[PDB]
Amino acid sequence: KHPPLPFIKDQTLYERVFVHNSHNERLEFLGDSVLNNLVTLIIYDKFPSASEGKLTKMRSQLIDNHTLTQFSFEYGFDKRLKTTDEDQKVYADIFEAYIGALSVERGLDLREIKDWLEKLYAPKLEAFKVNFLQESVNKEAKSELYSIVGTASSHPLYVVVEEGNGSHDFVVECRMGNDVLGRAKAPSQKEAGLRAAMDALKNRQLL
Amino acid sequence: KHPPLPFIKDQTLYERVFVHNERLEFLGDSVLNNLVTLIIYDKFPSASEGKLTKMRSQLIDNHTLTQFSFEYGFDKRLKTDEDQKVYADIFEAYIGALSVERGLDLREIKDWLEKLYAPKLEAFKVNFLQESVNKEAKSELYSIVGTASSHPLYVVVEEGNGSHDFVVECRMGNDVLGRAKAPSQKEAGLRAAMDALKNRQLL
């Protein structure tokens, strides 16, 4: 994996992590914690415009077994792991223990680790900056929304409420007669107009 | 950017994936499983059946499923909150809805899916799926067993100026700790230390 793997010098420690009050379980516990705090800092800093809800989803996606297993094979943990076979949520639990080792081997410092993770996650975060920080696209929503609730009698209008490209404020309201089915903000009036329809379709009711 | 979310015209079929969904995730799962197979088959024409099984397995697991479900705001079309098997399964029901509404002609979701997977498929074709790279190995191996007074030596045991390729052993004492072959003498030497490091028995 393109960032260099931070090293465990102490043999007795490395072996706590790859031998297989009883055995190492405190490193799984410390690693988990360090890994979830570190990842929290990194995303919070990189995505200032994301809600707490999106941050919570981003974090669960990068601390979970799929991605931690992916890291573990790109560092060949299946090979370091002195075992016997392959679900099997294990490799993520090794990886948590491992981070738990780097952390103790440094006196519980963690800046040296935050930096490695800040690189280890770069491709995953640029993936999210493109497709997840943002909302969606849907150049179609106004007619899609019209085909649920629109005739010639009463069809939905999209009335701008705050206007002007001055320092940025374009917000439009999608109203069907008297009720504001959805409101959204975008740098332009049509982008906001479509997004106002997109928010409305998130709530399909009339059967 | 990722492609937008195809539309579901039929209200009640929309509700059969979001307000409740059985039998659409059945159809959704096999559909999705196969279109991803076709896709990766075209884009990795040398990948053996073992790599293809792994590639399909990652592209279809709940993790990436659930994040397609999160990037299209499935959390918000859904009316218990929170991996997540469940969001993965609403996503399968969705692909199934898409299919029914178009009479099980799947060619036009393959195109969507190809757009939708275009990022991750480049990542796999980069040169690795689950592979290591060269390292900083000579020095970290040195840190375990090495003094200036006695330390390991990376001796060339065959040479490869274009014709064949280098193999170098990592010798210390009487014992060779690790050997490797790689296009370079550096790359072989580093990998030969990585091999010795994957086995820190003692010595």
What is the rounded (10 degree) CA torsion for B28, B29, B31, B35? 130
Interface membership of B142 toward A (CB under 8 Å) = no
> Of residues A28, A32, A93, A199, which has the active-site annotation?
A32
CATH: 3.30.160.20, 3.30.300.30, 3.30.360.10, 1.10.1040.10. Which one for A140-202? 3.30.160.20
Tokens of A108: 């519980």
Tokens of A4: 């260099």
Contact between A137 and B61 using a beta-carbon 8 Å cutoff: no
C-beta separation of A38 from A117 below 8 A: yes
Instruction: Supply φ then ψ for residue B34, to 5 degrees.
Output: -85, -45
Resolution (A): 2.9
- Helix, strand or coil, per DSSP, at residue B152: coil
Could you give the strand order of the β-sheet that contains A171-176, starting from the edge strand earlier in sequence? A157-162, A171-176, A179-185
Contact between B11 and A148 using a beta-carbon 8 Å cutoff: yes
Contact between B14 and A204 using a beta-carbon 8 Å cutoff: yes
A32 catalytic residue (yes or no): yes
CA distance B94 to A89: 27
Contact between A65 and B83 using a beta-carbon 8 Å cutoff: yes
Residue indicated by tokens 């979830």: A36
Q: Which chain B residue shows the shortest CA-CA distance from A145?
A: B9
A93 catalytic residue (yes or no): no
Which residues in chain B belong to E strands, given as ranges? 153-158, 167-172, 175-181
The second-level CATH assignment, the architecture, of B136-198 is 2-Layer Sandwich (3.30)
User: Measured on CA atoms in the order A59, A61, A65, A68, is the torsion positive or negative?
Assistant: negative
Q: Which class for A152: exposed (0-12), middle (13-18), buried (19 or more C-beta within 10 A)?
A: exposed
Q: What angle do CA B68, B69, B71 make, to 5 degrees?
A: 60
CB < 8 Å from A in window 94-123 of B? 119, 123
User: Across the interface, which of B4, B11, B62 has its CB nearest the CB of A137?
Assistant: B4
CA distance B49 to B55: 10
Q: Which class for B196: exposed (0-12), middle (13-18), buried (19 or more C-beta within 10 A)?
A: buried
C-beta separation of B93 from B69 below 8 A: no
The Cα-based distances of B2 to A35, A131, A138, B134 in angstroms read 28, 6, 11, 33
> CATH fold of A11-132, please?
Ribonuclease iii, N-terminal Endonuclease Domain; Chain A (1.10.1520)
Contact between A207 and B1 using a beta-carbon 8 Å cutoff: no
CA distance B203 to B197: 11
| Nearest Cα to Cα of residue B5 among A74, A62, A166, A144 | A144
Say if B11-125 and B136-198 have the same CATH topology: no
Contact between A5 and B135 using a beta-carbon 8 Å cutoff: yes
Instruction: Supply φ then ψ for residue B72, to 5 degrees.
Output: -100, 15
C-beta separation of B40 from B55 below 8 A: yes
What is the rounded (10 degree) CA torsion for B137, B143, B149, B155? -20
Amino acid (one-letter) located at A161: V
| In CATH, B11-125 is 1.10.1520.10 | yes
- For chain A, the domains span 11-132, 140-202
C-beta separation of A131 from B71 below 8 A: yes
Which residues in B100-199 belong to E strands, given as ranges? 153-158, 167-172, 175-181
Residue indicated by tokens 């592209």: B59
Q: Up-side HSE of residue B67: CA atoms within 13 Å toward CB?
A: 29
Q: Cβ contacts of residue A111 below 8 Å, gap of 6+? A: none
Distance from CA of A133 to the nearest CA of B (A): 9
Q: Cβ contacts of residue A139 below 8 Å, gap of 6+? A: A194, B4
Q: Which chain A residue shows the shortest CA-CA distance from B75?
A: A202
CA distance B84 to B78: 14
Amino acid (one-letter) located at B115: K
Residue indicated by tokens 């103790």: A104
Chain B partners within 8 Å of A119 (Cβ)? none
DSSP state of A4: P
Q: Which chain A residue shows the shortest CA-CA distance from B136?
A: A4
Chain A partners within 8 Å of B62 (Cβ)? 66
C-beta separation of B39 from B55 below 8 A: no
The Cα-based distances of A115 to A17, A109, B69 in angstroms read 22, 12, 30
